[PDB]
């Protein structure tokens, strides 16, 4: 069936993270914003309403929300307030998310492994990995 919904929906709390500072620095985030965001350990709520997928991130620091349809490009406003154009597709069961803006691109993969949800964000060379568990 759509096994995609079952795989992704629910509430995910961050449990580990590597290279995030470096990833943000590369994406262009200011030093103070990088630091506070580095400590924020946000939740990622994923939901599905028919064809429309929704991903929220809530911390005390900052909240964000995207709603989208796979393959359909949409305007997104990132946590650091980049005005970007996003496209999220489903590849092998992985959610691939591309952000284009000002000639730059960054790719965010979200993939289920075991009971975990692994997010890999790649900008130019720099790769960051975050791991989430169901809350
Ligand atoms: K927090």
Swiss-Prot record:
PANTHER family: FATTY ACID BINDING PROTEIN (PTHR11955)
Location of Phosphoserine modifications: 16
Keywords: Acetylation, Cytoplasm, Lipid-binding, Nucleus, Phosphoprotein, Transport
UniProt free text on domains: Forms a beta-barrel structure that accommodates hydrophobic ligands in its interior.
Phosphotyrosine modifications at: 23
GO cellular component terms attached to this protein's record: cytoplasm; cytosol; extracellular exosome; lipid droplet; nucleus
The name this protein goes by in its record: Fatty acid-binding protein, adipocyte
Organism: Homo sapiens
A molecular function GO annotation: hormone receptor binding
